Amino acid sequence: MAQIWLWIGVIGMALGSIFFGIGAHNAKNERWKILFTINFFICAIATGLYLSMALGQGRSVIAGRPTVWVRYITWFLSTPLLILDLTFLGKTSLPITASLLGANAYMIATGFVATISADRTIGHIWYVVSCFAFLATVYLLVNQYRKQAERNYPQAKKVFRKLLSVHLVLWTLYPIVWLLGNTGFNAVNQGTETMFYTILDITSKVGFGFLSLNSMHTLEKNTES
Amino acid sequence: MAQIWLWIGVIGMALGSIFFGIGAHNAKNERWKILFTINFFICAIATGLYLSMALGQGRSVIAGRPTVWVRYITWFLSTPLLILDLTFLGKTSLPITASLLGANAYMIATGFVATISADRTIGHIWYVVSCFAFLATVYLLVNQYRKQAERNYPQAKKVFRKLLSVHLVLWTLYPIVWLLGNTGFNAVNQGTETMFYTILDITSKVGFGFLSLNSMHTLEKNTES
Amino acid sequence: MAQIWLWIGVIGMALGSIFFGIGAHNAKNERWKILFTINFFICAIATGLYLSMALGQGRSVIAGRPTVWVRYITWFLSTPLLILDLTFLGKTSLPITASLLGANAYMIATGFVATISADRTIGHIWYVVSCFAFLATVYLLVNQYRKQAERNYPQAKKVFRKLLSVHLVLWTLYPIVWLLGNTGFNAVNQGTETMFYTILDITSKVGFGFLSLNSMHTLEKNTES
Numbered sequence: 001m002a003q004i005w006l007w008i009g010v011i012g013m014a015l016g017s018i019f020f021g022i023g024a025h026n027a028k029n030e031r032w033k034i035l036f037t038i039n040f041f042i043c044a045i046a047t048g049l050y051l052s053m054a055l056g057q058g059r060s061v062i063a064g065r066p067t068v069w070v071r072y073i074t075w076f077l078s079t080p081l082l083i084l085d086l087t088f089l090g091k092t093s094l095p096i097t098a099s100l101l102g103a104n105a106y107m108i109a110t111g112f113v114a115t116i117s118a119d120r121t122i123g124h125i126w127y128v129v130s131c132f133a134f135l136a137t138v139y140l141l142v143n144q145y146r147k148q149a150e151r152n153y154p155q156a157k158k159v160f161r162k163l164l165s166v167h168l169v170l171w172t173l174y175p176i177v178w179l180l181g182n183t184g185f186n187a188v189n190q191g192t193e194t195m196f197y198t199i200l201d202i203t204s205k206v207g208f209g210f211l212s213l214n215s216m217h218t219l220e221k222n223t224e225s
Numbered sequence: 226m227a228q229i230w231l232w233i234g235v236i237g238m239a240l241g242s243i244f245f246g247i248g249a250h251n252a253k254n255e256r257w258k259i260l261f262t263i264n265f266f267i268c269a270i271a272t273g274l275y276l277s278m279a280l281g282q283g284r285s286v287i288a289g290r291p292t293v294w295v296r297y298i299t300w301f302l303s304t305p306l307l308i309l310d311l312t313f314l315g316k317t318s319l320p321i322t323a324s325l326l327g328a329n330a331y332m333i334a335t336g337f338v339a340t341i342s343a344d345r346t347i348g349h350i351w352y353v354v355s356c357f358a359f360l361a362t363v364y365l366l367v368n369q370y371r372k373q374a375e376r377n378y379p380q381a382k383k384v385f386r387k388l389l390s391v392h393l394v395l396w397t398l399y400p401i402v403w404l405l406g407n408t409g410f411n412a413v414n415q416g417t418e419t420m421f422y423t424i425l426d427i428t429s430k431v432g433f434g435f436l437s438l439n440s441m442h443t444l445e446k447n448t449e450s
Numbered sequence: 451m452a453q454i455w456l457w458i459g460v461i462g463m464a465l466g467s468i469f470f471g472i473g474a475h476n477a478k479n480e481r482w483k484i485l486f487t488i489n490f491f492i493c494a495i496a497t498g499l500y501l502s503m504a505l506g507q508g509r510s511v512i513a514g515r516p517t518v519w520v521r522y523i524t525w526f527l528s529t530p531l532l533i534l535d536l537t538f539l540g541k542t543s544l545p546i547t548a549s550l551l552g553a554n555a556y557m558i559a560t561g562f563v564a565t566i567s568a569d570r571t572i573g574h575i576w577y578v579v580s581c582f583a584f585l586a587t588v589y590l591l592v593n594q595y596r597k598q599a600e601r602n603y604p605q606a607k608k609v610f611r612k613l614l615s616v617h618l619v620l621w622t623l624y625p626i627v628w629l630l631g632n633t634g635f636n637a638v639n640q641g642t643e644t645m646f647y648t649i650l651d652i653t654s655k656v657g658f659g660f661l662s663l664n665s666m667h668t669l670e671k672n673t674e675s
């Protein structure tokens with residue numbers, strides 16, 4: 001079960017990479033070329049890292065607990081680019097953009113330590129810290145990020161509402177899967193945990209990538225002379 | 226002894242993080258929001274890494290020698306932000322800013338290898354190399370950095386004198402502690418070495434952070450219309 | 451044989467570092483100071499990493515196969531700066547510059563996994579992936595990169611022709627050495643493989659660095675008023 005869902009992730013990310021790369025090659029406009037290129041690399045990074053996991057790499061048995069630590073490499077590299085999708089679209093200021101990237105990096109870093117710690121009490125402490133880092137990004141996204149975006153695009157508040165709603169709902173699912181998996185309560189087996197993360201990853205990457213392109217199109221139409 | 230001083234570092238860095246974060250949230254002005262945000266992340270990174278050390282993590286017994294290798298992660302991430310405090314305040318040029326960040330990264334990288342090498346002869350070679358990297362940053366700071374700062378703020382030469390004096394004196398203490406600790410002569414025990422680095426870290430981070438804010442205030446008063 | 455060629459690399463890189471550093475210290479002009487500084491750090495990074503290899507570090511016996519994994523650290527840090535030599539000279543756009551840096555990072559990252567994988571079938575898969583990442587950079591260099599450079603310097607198409615010819619020919623030699631060495635067919639012994647990489651590294655770093663300076667001089671003469 002786990003093995004097929006890793007290959008489904010390879011396929012899904014590779015397809016996202018091809019279609020974003022084609023969009024990048026045929027962009028009209030530097031802004032469009034940038035946005036296609038960000039999403040190309042989100043999906044291209046995830047393709048290679050899903051390929052390593054599918055081939056059996058990036059995994060260690062830590063005190064009896066199978067642990068796919070390479071998952072946190074993918075997340076550390078791709079989540080900042082998703083943040084950049086948002087801040088590129090919202091024309092976010094430099095301090096708020098840096099704060100989002102830093103709090104996000106803090107979340108993935110502490111989530112990684114939460115995962116590879118042999119002492120699961122210590123790991124669960126790091127889980128809580130990582131949740132507070134996520135909550136920091138929630139605060140920044142629904143306050144300073146949102147208000148700048150709505151000031152920059154007064155006619156497209158609904159666009160950023162949908163982007164933020166999809167981002168917040170999807171990203172909140174990751175710490176739930178983490179608690180269900182063998183990092184937490186072990187309420188679901190490894191095949192199910194892997195299926196969950198594969199579906200989340202394809203949705204938060206390919207799915208969010210296509211939503212970012214559709215948002216760009218709406219913003220540019222609302223901004224034509 | 227070592228254990229309490231790691232917790233003192235957690236407390237000190239967390240307090241610095243809270244007060245710099247509060248300053249960031251209430252900044253008037255993008256320049257002030259940037260400077261508060263740099264110092265927030267300096268202290269927030271150090272808080273998490275001090276928490277890992279306090280919990281017993283980030284440590285390895287290398288050929289019989291207890292070695293807190295995670296100390297070099299904290300330093301690799303936080304020292305460039307301290308460099309940025311300086312170059313942000315001095316409005317340093319891009320080549321000099323990159324040279325300071327690169328020489329600094331070289332220093333921490335070679336200091337890390339100097340520390341984890343089992344062969345302490347090789348480690349001591351890397352210590353010397355790291356000292357020359359530090360000396361490179363000294364040269365850049367008291368020449369090109371200082372002269373640009375004084376050209377940018379002709380009325381505030383004393384401000385950069387104090388910043389540079391505190392930076393140079395404090396940062397020179399780290400290679401002295403390193404020679405005293407079990408990386409070198411082992412003239413002081415691990416509790417004392419840990420106390421020294423905790424006091425240095427709180428001073429060079431929280432202390433220097435507050436000095437950078439006070440300097441900003443002096444520069445802005447000297448620069449009001 | 452391997453040992454002397456590692457020391458030859460130390461010497462060659464150190465000499466390149468000194469002469470690029472002297473150029474940086476005596477630059478007239480921010481553009482010249484930037485270009486000297488990029489090449490200084492290319493060679494300074496390679497000096498330190500060649501010193502680690504010469505001292506016997508950065509090497510692991512992976513399932514019976516001696517593997518100098520630190521070679522990929524040098525490459526991950528220095529190859530983006532060589533890309534920057536090119537994009538600095540060509541005044542390349544942000545999306546094309548990011549795509550070159552990302553595809554290049556992808557190449558070195560997958561080349562590293564291709565090297566440290568114990569399963570050499572999996573390693574050879576990663577070799578192919580890394581070759582396609584290289585081919586991606588070839589496509590970007592001879593299409594978008596070249597066309598922007600020739601649009602920016604209509605009178606100096608030959609300058610970018612020589613830069614690209616040297617870059618493409620030299621960099622193609624690395625995957626050939628990799629196939630000849632103990633990562634592939636093991637057709638040459640470790641001393642010969644090390645000699646090959648040392649000569650390639652000195653040429654692609656010091657040699658290309660001096661070519662980038664000579665190109666800058668030609669571009670500036672073709673651009674004087």
Ligand SMILES: CCCCCCCC/C=C/CCCCCCCC(=O)O
Nearest residue numbers: 080098101102105262263266309313
């Ligand atoms: C792989 C992605 C990692 C992202 C790390 C993000 C780190 C964020 C740190 C924030 C502090 C810097 C705030 C802005 C500094 C601006 C400096 C300047 O303007 O000179």
Ligand SMILES: CCCCCCCC/C=C/CCCCCCCC(=O)O
Nearest residue numbers: 305323326327330487488491534538
């Ligand atoms: C975590 C922090 C690490 C800091 C690393 C710093 C590396 C410094 C390297 C210097 C070489 C680059 C010099 C300036 C390049 C400008 C490029 C351009 O203008 O296109």
Ligand SMILES: CCCCCCCC/C=C/CCCCCCCC(=O)O
Nearest residue numbers: 037038041084088530548551552555
């Ligand atoms: C050590 C060097 C590593 C280099 C990594 C390069 C990663 C390349 C990734 C490309 C995606 C980003 C494309 C441009 C984003 C611009 C963002 C913006 O303008 O706000």
